[PDB]
Amino acid sequence: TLNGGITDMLVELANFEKNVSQAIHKYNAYRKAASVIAKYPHKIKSGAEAKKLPGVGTKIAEKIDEFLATGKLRKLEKIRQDDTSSSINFLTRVTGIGPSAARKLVDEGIKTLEDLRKNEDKLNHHQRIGLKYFEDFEKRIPREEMLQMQDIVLNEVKKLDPEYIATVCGSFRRGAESSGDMDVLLTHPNFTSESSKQPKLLHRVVEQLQKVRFITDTLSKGETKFMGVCQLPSENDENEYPHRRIDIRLIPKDQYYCGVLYFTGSDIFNKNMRAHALEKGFTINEYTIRPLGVTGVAGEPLPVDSEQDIFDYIQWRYREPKDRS
Template identity: 50%
Template sequence: MDSKRKPKSHPNEDICDMLNELANYENNVKRDVHRSRAYRKAAKTLSDLNYRVKSGEDAIKLPGIGKSIAAKIEEYLNTGEMKKLNAARKDDHFAIINDLTRVSGIGPVFAKELMESGITSIEELKKNIHLLNHHQKIGLKYLNDFEQKIPRSEMEQMEKFIKKVAKEIEKNIIITICGSYRRGLPESGDIDVLITDENSHNYLNLLVEKLTNKGFITDTIAQGDTKFMGVCKLQNFEKHRRIDIRFIPFNDYYCGVLYFTGSQMFNQEMRRHALEQGYTLNEHSLRKLGSTGVPGEPLVVASERDIFEYISFPYKEPSERNW
């Protein structure tokens, strides 16, 4: 790994790193899921901004940031540190669990079990690989690669390659790369692919087979009838990347596209607004609520815009959903 300090990917990256570290502490050591989620939500809000927050007063005006977190942001901006994080970093258990949970597939409960069995570092984990399941072994194998963000230019090449291979199977196949990539952000954590066609033919396993034969998919973590989880790498590129491919029936597809595009906060606002308008919205369907509050049959949705129109929500381009 390059020893030079990497350039910031967004103006609030240092603040987000600290909030995410606090989120890990609350989740992994204190087991406080709600507080952990609050820190992570605040970090996500700040990461989507194209400007630097100047104070806690600025921060508290943003969605998902309350008084307590705004005060910590103010403290950091004034002093360069957060006292609560300094205290957390002195907790030996936190450092060990935080290190072990870097591995994909290892959660805080199993990390604690490993720690109690005497495994306190990634290096020791490598010597005890027999304790890991298939997913965790792959996570350990590609740990350094998975921790590196994927530049947009690489995502574009992967999208082009996946769509080209898919068209070899069926020319009318529909492929959408979702997540932060679809929202136009410069980096992504992984590749999230949705697949369907207008007749709801499920080409998932055939696509995975062809991508594997062409050397793009290098490892399988899990594979079922509707979802594949694995690892991929473009030819002439160094790093392996996490990839998920989901088949979604055509009638559910655009609800799925909306959901997996995100952001999480934008999805929450859409669902809240839908309920106010008398609908229920999730990743599978949009349904009208009856007089008793029971959802009716799924409405016909042939595009994302249909969803916005049904619930009278102004259409937002994916690049406008970075809340």
């Protein structure tokens, strides 16, 4: 393509000028500028030969000869950047700041790492810790450190009560080399889908991990889900080990392997498996597996004492976790 860089430059400029500006008049303009350049049969060398065209005002002729020289355009940079969109989807990197709050902060003037680091009175505790450890939560965790994190949690849990079952899921159980965080599913026989609702089964484990200084912060502690911050022990090491994201979900005993399956996942695999279940007449769910009757009337949850049970029901061979991409 001859120009092309020039026309994608003008098209994006037109779009912006109508969906942010609202000056449909100069949107109509750039449109004309672009169609023409695309007609013109020779490669634009400069913005003066590019000015000499029936629909290219000298403001635009001033841009082209520029984009030809720098290989870019500052007006596009200072536009792509401030994109009311792109800011929200940045603030949302900070754990604790979703869409709703991001939109608030943004169109109230705050949208960058430093704008934030200059008004923590506008943030709650979750958003605060999430800010303090932004860069830390941005790193990967070598399988190596995860194994160690597995041991701390795993043995601490068995020491409290041997009847607990605890499995780390996520990219770690699938045998991955690198993880984003740690995701623990916890259950205990005293807790079934018929039973009371026992928040202490979870609290007791969380507090024991804080007690031994693994968990360093709470972002959200619920009745059934805790999300916080954890850290591997060290020596005299400066930044020794960064702080990681850890999540701890408590699940009724009788619907644990439904939750383990689901949280080991790969979404693409979850998608395919549920879909296969739905074709042999079952519905799978992060809690249960149910016959799917005539219509979409689901029957009674079937007994699940292991992942294998879920596979057998839909007539699939057990897929090793490493094998669930």
